[PDB]
Amino acid sequence: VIPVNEITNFKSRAEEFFPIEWYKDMLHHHPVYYHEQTNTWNVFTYEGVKQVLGNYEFFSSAGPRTTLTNLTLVDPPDHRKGRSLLAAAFTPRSLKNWEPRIKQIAEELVENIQDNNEINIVEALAAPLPSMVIADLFGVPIQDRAQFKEWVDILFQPDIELQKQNAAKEYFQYLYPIVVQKRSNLSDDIISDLIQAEVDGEKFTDNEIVQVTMLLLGAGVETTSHAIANTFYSLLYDDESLYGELRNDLELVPNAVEEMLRYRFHMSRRDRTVKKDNNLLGVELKEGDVVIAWMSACNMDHRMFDDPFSINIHRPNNKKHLTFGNGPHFCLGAPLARLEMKIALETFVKKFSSIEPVEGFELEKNLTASATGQSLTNLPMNVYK
Amino acid sequence: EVIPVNEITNFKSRAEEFFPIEWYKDMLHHHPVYYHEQTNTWNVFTYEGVKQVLGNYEFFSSAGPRTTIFPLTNLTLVDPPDHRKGRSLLAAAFTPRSLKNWEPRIKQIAEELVENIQDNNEINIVEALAAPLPSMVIADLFGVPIQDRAQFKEWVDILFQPYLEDIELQKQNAAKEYFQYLYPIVVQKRSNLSDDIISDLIQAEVDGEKFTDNEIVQVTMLLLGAGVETTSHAIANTFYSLLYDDESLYGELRNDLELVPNAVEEMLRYRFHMSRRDRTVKKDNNLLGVELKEGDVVIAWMSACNMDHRMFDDPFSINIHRPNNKKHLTFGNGPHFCLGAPLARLEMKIALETFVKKFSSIEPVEGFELEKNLTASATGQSLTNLPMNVYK
Ligand code: HEM
Ligand code: HEM
């Protein structure tokens, strides 16, 4: 495993939460940057990251160093089978029917919020929504969602390591009978979709489906909670006028969501192992070289995004950011995350006329380590009707 | 505002700086264009990149507040919109005619030095040939009277030959004595045009303008600083390579004397370290693969780009038969290309031919330590002495 912390070498939690100064330095002085201590190549330009992520002919996901069942360590010469099987659960049809179910879960969370005093938007919406939503789309029976939610909070929400292997044991032992039941009772959920999915005649087995669900929870529960929490932090400490714009016209939420993914999702970075000699990045890369594509950095590249260090929900090409990746490994749950963010934002802005930060908030005292870097543990705010 | 290049390299021994082959490898492979935060400089190591920086005057200027060194008279800090006048005036002294007439005069000086070397006994080719030859040669082409060359040689040894505090006052006294001595000579030569560099600088005219007596003396001081020490360095490194690199090279040169030009050109590619010139960015561009803004300083490492496998096949090995050895960038590129390049090539060839023609073989000395015989210089580290045994 690659210790990415040595490449950045931050000396504070708040800097890692929004590494805007490091992004500037690396975009300006080290577009392609070899790090001697980790033996890794680091790319920050939009064109460079797009090459690394998309061009599978030269950059492989299968590699010793990392930062039909596991489609994240496989390349297109075999990736299509696992990709197509998993894509059958995320068709435009399923996404269309998930809007009222996700919208309904968000109503309970927003209707529960009353002002009176300061609220914690992380515990009240940012953290519970992805967990409650993914339990719904999995088809977990309603009477077990509490226990399911508890496992997900231990696994993917920030001795601790022994508590996690007991959660993994309980998860696999509980969900395997569920997958067996659903094969004889096809409902309208993801597990039922993974069962009947067929590619090249092959299908998933019961044991393979349980692993796949564990891959989806790890891929779109914490990252979605992070994006929702950062969206509210930006609505509080970045552009003050943005909230009033969203409430004047609710139709601007999709643009606001897409701009939060470009500007306020840190940090985004995936590795690729070089499979063929080339100088496609401006340096001579040999086979076996590890290249880290920094996407949260390339979303600030002025060669692609005009005025990149400012928030602008009217920038016409905000959707071409690389927070969801590029190429064959493009995020399969990207439309779901976009729907979750829009619904959580729409339902919130429709209720409250204005929001205001809290007096004594210190960013450094409310951050914890996470997969992307640093995540808000809580986010106090005052809300008004 | 001079740039301390030592912080970019940050060597931990003199021997590494004398032949930084491992550092070149890392930078060619991992940092082709390398921004250094402590000096705020861009560093280029690729052959194609260095050729852009050195040659493309439209974007890279020699006139710049920051320089890596320390009108019509100093043509090295000026750009083509004005560089042409000083260049042409100085070029009138280095025509193909003068170079042809300098061969017998340089050949005679090398004979004086080689017959003096004497047969058996270990010799120091730095004291015996590498150091004295460029000083004696440049005095001849300057037209310095024969009875005054001894004092002239001493001034050059203090100013441009490496070796507590007395040095800085000893050097400013040498420059003072130099300018006071040479000004009457230039006045005399205006009425006695001979066949030397000072006579050519007198009769030189560009755009109708000419040099004045005070301006010509400045120019001669620029030539001594530009082609006396660097040439001594190249000759000394050639003999070090003949001793510790390719053992078979000396016997090959003696079988066929016509290979000396190839040997000379390969020593300039392989064993001249370190070469580096600065350029200040005059226009926003991405011609090197990075976003360069106006006012940025770019250092073109030429001794490094001579090891670029994209241009020279098998670049880390000595090969005097490589067909493109002459495309190295040790003499620069573009409008500021070294004006004394044919002279330096002639001096190296003549010093090498005259030596191998006399001695059948050379052998290094038992207890030579490279680290104990190096001193600081303009290019990095220079040999103070180099013992060798000569035979036949
Ligand atoms: C803010 C939310 C999200 C972000 C930033 C995000 C980010 C990413 C990125 C960058 C990739 C590509 C990795 C690479 O190219 O190597 C990816 C892949 C993937 N994502 Fe997401 N994701 C999010 C939400 C979700 C959700 C809600 C799901 C729901 C299932 C999901 C499931 C997946 C899967 C299965 C893959 C692997 C697809 C493949 O490798 O072919 N993600 N994600
Ligand atoms: C091994 C021998 C030599 C080497 C490596 C060498 C190297 C160089 C280089 C690289 C430049 C260009 C620097 C730039 O682009 O800014 C230069 C310029 C110059 N050199 Fe040499 N040189 C050598 C010998 C000589 C000799 C023997 C003379 C005799 C007068 C000489 C006189 C000059 C002059 C006048 C310039 C100015 C050219 C201009 O600015 O247009 N050099 N030298």
Numbering used by the authors:
A (entry chain B): 5 to 71, 86 to 176, 184 to 410
B (entry chain A): 4 to 73, 85 to 177, 182 to 410
Structure paper excerpt:
Cytochrome P450 (CYP) is a heme-containing enzyme that catalyzes hydroxylation reactions with various substrate molecules. Steroid hydroxylases are particularly useful for effectively introducing hydroxyl groups into a wide range of steroids in the pharmaceutical industry. This study reports a newly identified CYP steroid hydroxylase (BaCYP106A6) from the bacterium Bacillus sp. and characterizes it using an in vitro enzyme assay and structural investigation. The CYP106 and CYP109 families hydroxylate various types of steroids and terpenoids. Furthermore, NMR analysis of the chemical structures of the hydroxylated products of steroids indicated that the C15 region was the hydroxylation site by BaCYP106A6 with high regio- and stereoselectivity.
